[PDB]
Structure 1
């Protein structure tokens, strides 16, 4: 028998088989299942993902809350508050599995990403994306959503998930949602709370550098890169790990055309990242 599902209410399921059965039943009833993968501690950035999923006609939104140990090398856990926010957004399904339910046999079969996973964010964390793709593949198989939502803020992650979907012939649409930003441009992130006042003010340099580059781009790729570097060079205590212009699939940037500029920097012990669309010329 299919588990109970109360429309218009937030239905919480912890067992994978339960959400799998409900999702299947709902799709048969005329709903389009939308999956929004999270690790909890929800903020406006996550709500933008949720709102994107909810606006699809016939949508039933499934928000997974799962701190995936495999993508780590202390993590904030606010169950009650996260669920309240989801209820406030009109989300009808929350999937909150335990590590044991997701990995009943430990790490055995896993996903091995292509070479892009060793670059950029993969430099300091070479096994991070294998963890991300493995848990995302599992969530996709459990929930079987029509569309899955990820923030553009973690652009490399978004691109790797598009590679996962294409490479494994997955029947799901991957939707990238624009980065939600604080009033001064800083990309919203749970980790921002760790920045002291001086670091928080200096942190504006990442987004300022990216938007400066996007507008400098009419003058060419070098102009865009040099403008971004100048902005980052005007900030104290911002240790840039990388500032790279690539094509939209993160391969080498074209002579002209569309691309993406990505930056990551360390402010004290907090690593921040950001990125932006760039049109060369």
Structure 2
């Protein structure tokens, strides 16, 4: 064990440091809560923290790591916002006791060797054009789950496909951890929190509202069925200035089929200039 000063933010770099300290708190009967982030924290992140925080006797581990494996190449990796400064101050403000900030060398000392192969879900939606994206995410998440060994792990529903693949990872490998999805934190107009938002000029920031509006429209249109919930989304996206829709898709909650159903999930991906915005909502199909 290295130092753990309780009630204070404790920052570890080494997997073995966070692992030892984690394992120690797990005996003293505290409950290890893990919030995996790529940093550049926003209110969405803090909701995850706060939800972690509200677990009786929780000790909250925020991991901060920009996983080069879920990226390209790609274009993604050198772009991704990096502000450990703010990130760590926000965590201190929130009363988070551990930040785990590993080096790429310490996570990947053997490069990409043993990895997680996701199911067929991972080739769809966001995995369509990014076929190794989810393998990266799941490999890093498994490794964090192994290093920290939490009781519970907290993700947003912003990345809803990731959250399902994570529930799969956890079921398929018999991981002893509860996955907590946390409803998406939204701007005042409805724009889903994202680090990727900073890269929207005013004009785009204003057109961006169209995603949350289309989806909230379809969830109310849905009493009249799937076609009308879809047509209602599409109509709003259409009415909106330089939103180019990648996809708009209605699925079941586990991102399978989508029956004549009630409960489903509506997912949109769109570009505003160069900025790719994702969003999704619970939909109950009415007729």
TM-score using structure 2 length: 0.96
Shift of 1:38: 0.5
Which residue number in structure 2 is paired with residue 46 of structure 1? 45
Which consecutive aligned stretches of 4+ in structure 1 deviate over 4 angstroms post-superposition?
Answer: none
2-side partners of 1:112 and 1:207: how far apart?
32
1-side partners of 2:277 and 2:132: how far apart?
19
Partner SS state of residue 181, structure 2: strand
Shift of 1:79: 1.4
Which residue number in structure 1 is paired with residue 63 of structure 2? 64
Which residue number in structure 1 is paired with residue 143 of structure 2? 138
Shift of 1:266: 0.8
* CA offset digits 1:40-74 (Å, max 9, x no partner): 11110100000000000010000000010001119
Which residue number in structure 2 is paired with residue 9 of structure 1? 8
* CA offset digits 1:224-259 (Å, max 9, x no partner): 001001110101211101000000000010112200
Partner SS state of residue 112, structure 1: coil
Shift of 1:6: 0.7
CA contact (8 A) 1:33 1:147 kept: yes
Partner SS state of residue 228, structure 2: helix
Partner SS state of residue 131, structure 1: helix
Partner SS state of residue 184, structure 1: coil
| Number of residues of Structure 1 aligned to a counterpart in Structure 2 | 280
Unaligned stretches of 5+ in structure 1?
none
1-side partners of 2:32 and 2:204: how far apart?
41
2-side partners of 1:21 and 1:111: how far apart?
25
Partner SS state of residue 196, structure 2: helix
**Residue number among 83, 91, 104 corresponding to 1:78 in the alignment:** 83
Shift of 1:148: 0.2
Q: Does 1:186 align with 2:185?
A: no
CA contact (8 A) 1:73 1:127 kept: no
TM-score using structure 1 length: 0.98
* CA offset digits 1:120-151 (Å, max 9, x no partner): 00112111100000000000000000000010
Q: Does 1:157 align with 2:156?
A: no
Residue range with higher mean Cα deviation, 164-173 or 192-201: 192-201
Unaligned stretches of 5+ in structure 2?
74-79
CA contact (8 A) 1:61 1:93 kept: yes
Q: Does 1:269 align with 2:274?
A: yes
